[PDB]
RNA sequence: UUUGAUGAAUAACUUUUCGAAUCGCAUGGCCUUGUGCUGGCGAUGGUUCAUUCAAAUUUCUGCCCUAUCAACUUUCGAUGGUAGGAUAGUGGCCUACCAUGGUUUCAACGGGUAACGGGGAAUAAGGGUUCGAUUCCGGAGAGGGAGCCUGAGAAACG
RNA sequence: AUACAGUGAAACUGCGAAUGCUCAUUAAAUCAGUUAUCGUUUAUUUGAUAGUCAUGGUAUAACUGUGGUAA
């Protein structure tokens, strides 16, 4: 049950000090350095779950590698952002051109934009 | 570059005879990268306090090298500035370009030589085509812009007036000082 | 910790008083910052009420002044001669207030060469400076007193000896040489 | 004084916190009391 | 001599310009207590440096003002005066005498020996133990 | 991890990125605004001074402001823990091999003692002192101040025991020899003094020598061999002597560097290479072949050092210095690395194929 | 303990406010504000206790945030506001002024006021002083620090300021033979026309003050506030004229 | 000679602090009808100073029995000076450098004090013989020594 | 209402959370009184108070999903 953590190098268990902005350990108590357990970065022969980014595809399409997308969930809040997205100007409003998620209830069919940041 | 570091770094090694000093040849190759970084913060201008403090630090730092040096960098204040019309001709110049632009870019030429006028009192060097003709030229056009020019444009008027007060305080304080 | 109470001194009788509280907040007093000379490294505390109070541990430069005449400059030290408190102190060179300093000559004699035109050594009236003055200005290297506390302020003020300040303290040297 | 005169007098806390100590020399003390005396003064 | 300490004993904040000649070598400054009491001429042209000197160092005399009887003058720069007065005892109804051992700050401007009715102001703390500072001299 | 030498490979895997000129506090502050080994290797001002446990397990190193001690623990490569301290501690020893049992000079004149349960009182020194060195055999803390004294207090009794009185104005290190256990006290009037126990009393006085300055020396290091044979000192123009004991002459000079104080000299064990050690606060320190005086190479921290120490195993240099993470140094040609820093070998191996 | 306090028993309310003892077992704190606490009255003791026209804590917050009462001009939305000495509290819904003044037995009472009174409110001038810019400012006793005032404004004075502006108008100088109003001190309550000053630095400038029983008393400068001079008050006073029976 | 009036910024230095990229409502006026200009009445912040709530030290005034307690302090500076660090701030609070002091039969000092003590502290006893009711006790602790952290205010001990 | 404006959970952020019981006894100590702070600090209260880009970049939490471990 303990996690991989980046810099230590060491293929063992090791009692460190966890801090607020960083990987690995979220605190409850705001801002304290905390003594705790993370295995070591150098991976060896007691992992169990090893985890891997696809980065250069190679021969295979793989179902949930390659054939599955998600979309993502959410949008942009700002309008440069907006413009950024759509390859827009500083003249022309974003008004029309933000983005419109439908919702259904029962068969009431309503949808809804963002609040436009800035 | 950095301008938390700026001057900091400045003292650290362009202080002459100190610690981290530049050899005579290759501190010759970099004159040029020197004044025009030191154009720049100069071209910044001082409407905060640190930017205040920032042009009092540039203005303190450059009179330390040498003469040639600081002539050149009056040499490249004239090149950004110009007398070309004016001295081809007597007194006369042709293209009448007497913009807000010009003159702001005379205003600050003229900033730029009272600071250094008033660094290197004493000592300061005069080169003939280096500050002869731009200081009668601004001047010049800034009586033209005073006569050919009625009060609707109170912003030349004004800082054609504030242009012809320094360039006549910056001559009479030059005439003072070599 | 380090206090500052008056609760363990000895009574004006002459005699040990009893144990009275715990040592609070307020009543502290904080850690000395021996102030070297070096690369300027300068560190915040935080005391009572939002107040922010600098402790440079180390500097190379600091701000001088002449009275003589009046100019003021940032330049480059260079060492610790003296110190009225401690030879330790002295000789290690932290540097405090009321401190005795070789201080670079360099931007002063560019100033004043700048502004006279006379090579200083080798306004006529306001050239006449003093004759020690200007030795020190031909051996580049002038006496200073830092008058400015650097554990508190975090910065190093600095003043330039004169006549008789600079008798006395020349005749300390030359009574401890 | 305040601590320049030297106030010879037992420590209670530093008593027996590092007494005693087995006698760790590597050599039998004699010949390197000649040695000593057969040092650079001779 | 005035200036036997380690560092330069001067008054601070007070400059003079050698440039321009003087009569005098330093412009010493000194202030006026008010409060009814005098400056001294002898402090006017002290040349000792004290400051805890009620006149020309840089203290103040806000306050309490009272009065007192020297017995021994054997320190430097501070006194101790003893003041026996009066105290009431109401379970016999009867007075007795009793002495404060006070102790107090002179400046060397005033010259007190035993034997004198010295007036002392109190100031902010000066040392350890004292709080007062002497204004007015009365030998006898 | 930087490797610079050509000669041999120098391996900066700790401490600052950027060489010289460019300040930690606001480079760190901008790149965290836009590897490392020991968690949280630093004190944020300065360090001082640093040694290493002979259980080759904890490493402890004093901090400058908030002046404080790090006990390090390699079983965990991060603080074991922290302690703070009423003033700059100057120099300190560790009593037993393990972290637990310390004891210092500390810069108001005076002496802390330090436990796992804390600390233990302190004691005003008579006079300011230089440094403190521990006789093992028989319990005797023994301070070099500045003047003229070498106090000399026992721990079976804790008293002051005797100071040693020398014919000197100032007292500028004291070192022992383990097996030769001599009071070598060297004095910045050019000279060295030996005493012994069970004698308290001058073995030899000597080492007055020239420069070419021609001005008088500052004494700075003394040190000693494992041999209990040959004694080592080293001066403020930056000149070190190993001197071989039976001759008052110099056995091996060493003009090094620049006219820098040299302020720590430590030999190094090695089957092929019995080598020295020489560092002054030029930022610099120097390896050298002692048998012929050879310097085989040197370590530039590009920042001022304020302590060198090895590893006693083989490969490491812990470097105390005066920038924000004090920091160290494996030499492969020296050897490996110990017991919780046996994969640096593999990350060198991919720092040399780069 | 380990800061301020925020809890009082009723017991040891001031005497001033002449309450009962077991409304309840905690007296109304005053809010810290314009006035000094251990003179000053809470608005829900003057529309609670004295005027009766609330009778419930709920009650009085209610008017106060329904925004009647305006204190000094101004409305105010506290429950525990501190009105003072010689203030003003006005009603508009029942087109009213209170002109708040202290009795000869040492408690407040109210004045009712008219409206072209209530205008104005005079202010012990405390001290004047050179702030920034070189410009003067001057302190009352209720925080008022107004810029550019008479030069002749000493230290005790007492100026009149109209309150619709938040402007001096009058100033009065203390002399000998003024009107005073007693403030302080043993012999609050009694006025008439001071004597003189007795002057004691590092210590009390004491005032020997003859009221209208032509009878003479000593009183600490700093119980002193400033009316005029004799037979003309700046202030509707009540029946009375400082005399108990 | 009086009646009355006036006073009695420079040089730089620095992690930039700043001089609002924030909520509630005016709808007009003018022509350039752009939806252009312009604008008024209500909230949250920020610069400093005052004032308020507090807090810190501090002047002096007051409390038992006992000399079967005559010594006490420099053995953490005891007393004071000078200088510096430290503190929000003075001050031996702390360190150097020094001087060698202070308290005392007017009994210092010391001892015991049942010091659950006393304070008109507290409302009183609207007539109990002295008695009620309230308030301050004073400090420390929150497994135990040691060290650190924020906030205006903590040496917070959940 | 084709930007939202009602309402609103999770979270950012502002402020409070410095107004709990047990154990140990000091005679200028404490406490009460009275000062001083031209010698200090102050979140809050109220009062004044600064001519020196038709709008710049970020990020998260939450959510989605995939997992680990007896926890």
């Known amino acids: 049950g303990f996690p991989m953590k980046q810099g230590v190098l060491l293929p063992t268990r090791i009692k460190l000090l966890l801090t607020k902005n960083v990987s690995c350990y979220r605190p409850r108590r705001d801002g304290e350095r905390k003594r705790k357990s993370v295995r070591g970065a150098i991976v060896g022969p007691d992992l169990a779950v090893l985890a891997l980014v696809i980065v250069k595809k190679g021969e295979q399409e793989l179902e949930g590698l390659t054939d599955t997308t998600v979309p993502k969930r959410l949008g942009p809040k700002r309008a440069n952002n907006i413009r950024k997205f759509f390859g827009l100007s500083k003249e022309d409003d974003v008004r029309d051109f933000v983005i419109r998620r439908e919702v259904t209830k029962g068969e009431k069919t309503y949808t809804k934009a963002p609040k436009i940041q800035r | 570059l950095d301008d938390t570091l700026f001057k900091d770094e400045i003292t650290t090694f362009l202080t002459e005879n100190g610690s981290q000093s530049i050899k005579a040849e290759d501190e010759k190759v970099v004159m040029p990268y020197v004044l025009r970084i030191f154009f720049g913060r100069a071209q910044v201008p001082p409407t905060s306090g640190q930017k205040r403090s920032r042009k009092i630090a540039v203005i303190s730092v450059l009179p330390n090298f040498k003469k040639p040096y600081i002539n050149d960098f009056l040499s490249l204040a004239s090149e950004r500035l110009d007398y070309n019309y004016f001295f081809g001709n007597s007194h006369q110049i042709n293209s009448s370009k007497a913009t807000l632009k010009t003159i702001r870019r005379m205003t600050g030429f003229v900033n730029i030589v009272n600071s250094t006028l008033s660094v290197l009192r004493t000592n300061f060097p005069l080169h003939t085509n280096s500050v002869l003709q731009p200081l009668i030229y601004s001047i010049a056009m800034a009586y033209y812009v005073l006569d050919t020019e009625s009060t609707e444009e109170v912003h030349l008027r004004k800082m054609a007036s504030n242009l012809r007060q320094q360039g006549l305080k910056c001559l009479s304080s030059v005439f003072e000082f070599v | ?146 008058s400015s506390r650097p554990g508190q302020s975090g910065r190093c003020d600095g003043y330039i000896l004169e006549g008789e300040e600079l008798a006395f303290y020349l005749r300390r040297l030359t009574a401890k040489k | 004084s305040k601590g320049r005169k030297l106030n010879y007098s037992v420590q209670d806390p530093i008593a027996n916190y590092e007494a005693p100590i087995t006698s760790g020399y590597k050599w039998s003390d004699d010949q390197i009391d000649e040695f000593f005396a057969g040092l650079l003064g001779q | ?49 004290d400051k805890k000197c009620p006149f020309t160092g840089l203290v103040s005399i806000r306050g309490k003002i009272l009065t007192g009887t020297v017995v021994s003058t054997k320190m430097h720069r501070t006194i101790v005066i003893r003041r026996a007065y009066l105290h009431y005892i109401p379970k016999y109804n009867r007075y007795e005498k009793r002495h404060k051992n006070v102790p107090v700050h002179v400046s060397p401007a005033f010259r007190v020996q035993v034997g004198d009715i010295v007036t002392v102001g109190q100031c902010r703390p000066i040392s350890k133990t004292v709080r007062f500072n002497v204004v007015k001299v009365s030998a006898a | 991890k930087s490797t610079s030498a050509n000669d041999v490979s ?26 490392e080994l020991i968690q949280d290797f630093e004190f944020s001002e300065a360090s001082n001074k640093i040694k290493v446990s002979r259980d080759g397990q904890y490493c402890m190193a004093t901090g400058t402001y908030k002046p404080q001690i790090h006990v390090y623990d390699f079983a965990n490569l991060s603080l074991k823990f922290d302690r703070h301290t009423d003033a700059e501690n100057v120099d300190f020893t560790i009593l037993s091999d393990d972290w637990t049992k310390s004891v210092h000079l500390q810069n108001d004149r005076s002496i802390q003692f330090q436990n796992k349960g804390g600390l233990h009182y302190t004691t005003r020194i008579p006079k300011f002192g230089r440094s403190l060195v521990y006789n093992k055999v028989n319990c005797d803390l023994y301070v070099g101040a500045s003047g003229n004294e070498l106090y000399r207090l026992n721990l079976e009794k804790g008293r002051f025991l005797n100071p040693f009185k020398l014919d000197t104005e100032g007292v500028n290190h004291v070192s022992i020899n383990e097996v030769n256990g001599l009071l070598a006290a060297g004095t910045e009037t050019n000279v060295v003094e030996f005493w012994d126990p069970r004698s308290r009393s001058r073995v030899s006085k000597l ?61 190094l064990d090695n089957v092929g290479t019995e080598n020295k050690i020489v560092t002054c606060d030029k930022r610099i320190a120097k390896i050298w072949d002692r048998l012929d005086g050879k310097a085989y190479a040197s370590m530039e921290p590009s920042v001022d050092i304020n302590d060198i120490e090895h590893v006693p195993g083989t490969g490491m240099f812990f470097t105390a210095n005066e920038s924000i993470p004090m920091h160290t140094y494996y030499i492969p040609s020296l050897g490996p690395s110990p ?15 780069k | 303990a380990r800061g301020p306090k925020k809890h009082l028993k009723r017991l040891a309310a001031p005497h001033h406010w002449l309450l009962d003892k077991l409304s309840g077992c905690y007296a109304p704190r005053p809010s810290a504000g314009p006035h000094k606490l251990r003179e000053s009255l809470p608005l829900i003791v003057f529309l609670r206790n004295r005027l009766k026209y609330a009778l419930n804590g709920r009650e009085v917050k209610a008017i106060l945030m329904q925004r009647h009462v305006k204190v000094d001009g101004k409305v105010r939305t506290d429950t525990t506001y501190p009105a003072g ?161």
């Open chain 3, 1 to 146: 910790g380090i206090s500052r109470d008056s609760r363990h001194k000895r009574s004006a009788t002459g005699a040990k008083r009893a144990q009275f509280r715990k040592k609070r907040k307020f009543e502290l007093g904080r850690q000395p910052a021996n102030t070297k000379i070096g690369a300027k490294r300068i560190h915040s505390v935080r005391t009572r009420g939002g107040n922010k109070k600098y402790r440079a541990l180390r500097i190379e430069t600091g701000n001088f002044s002449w009275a003589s005449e009046g100019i003021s400059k940032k330049t480059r030290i260079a060492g610790v001669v003296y110190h009225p408190s401690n030879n330790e102190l002295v000789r290690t060179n932290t540097l405090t207030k009321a401190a005795i300093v070789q201080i670079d000559a360099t931007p002063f004699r560019q100033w004043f060469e700048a502004h006279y035109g006379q090579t200083l050594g080798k306004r006529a009236a306001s050239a006449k400076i003093e004759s020690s003055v200007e030795s020190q200005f031909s051996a580049g290297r002038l006496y200073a007193c830092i």
């Open chain 5, 1 to 49: 001599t005035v200036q036997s300490e380690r560092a330069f004993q001067k008054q601070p904040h007070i400059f003079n310009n050698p440039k321009v000649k003087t009569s005098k070598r330093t412009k010493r400054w000194y202030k006026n207590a008010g409060l009814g009491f005098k400056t001294p001429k002898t402090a006017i042209e002290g040349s000792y440096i």
């Open chain 6, 10 to 35: 120098v391996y900066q895997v700790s401490g600052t990125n950027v060489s010289r000129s460019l300040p930690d506090w606001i480079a760190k502050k901008r790149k965290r605004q836009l590897v």
């Open chain 6, 207 to 267: 080492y007055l020598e020239n420069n070419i300055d021609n001005r008088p020396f500052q004494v700075t290091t003394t040190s000693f061999r494992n041999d209990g044979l040959t004694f080592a000192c080293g001066t403020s123009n930056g000149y070190s002597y190993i001197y071989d004991l039976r001759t008052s002459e110099p056995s091996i000079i060493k003009d090094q560097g620049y006219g820098f104080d040299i302020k720590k000299i430590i030999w």
């Open chain 6, 339 to 353: 017991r919780w820093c046996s994969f640096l070998d593999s990350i060198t191996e991919e720092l040399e194929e």
């Open chain 7, 85 to 245: 000495f010689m203030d003003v509290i006005t009603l508009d819904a029942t087109n009213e002024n209170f002109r708040l003044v202290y009795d000869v037995k040492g408690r407040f009472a109210v004045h009712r006021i008219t409206d072209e009174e209530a205008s104005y409110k005079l202010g012990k001038v405390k001290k004047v002083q050179l702030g920034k810019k070189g410009v003067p400012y001057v302190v009352t006793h209720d925080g008022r620090t107004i810029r550019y005032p008479d030069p002749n404004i000493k230290v005790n004075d007492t100026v009149k300021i109209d309150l619709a502006s938040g402007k001096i108008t009058d100033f009065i100088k203390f002399d000998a033979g003024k009107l005073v109003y007693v403030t302080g001190g043993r012999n609050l309550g009694r006025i008439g026309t001071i004597v003189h000053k007795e002057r004691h630095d590092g210590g009390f400038d004491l005032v020997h003050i003859k009221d209208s029983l032509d009878n003479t008393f000593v009183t600490r400068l700093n119980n002193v506030f400033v009316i005029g001079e004799q037979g003309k008050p700046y202030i509707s006073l009540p029946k009375g004229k400082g005399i108990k029976l």
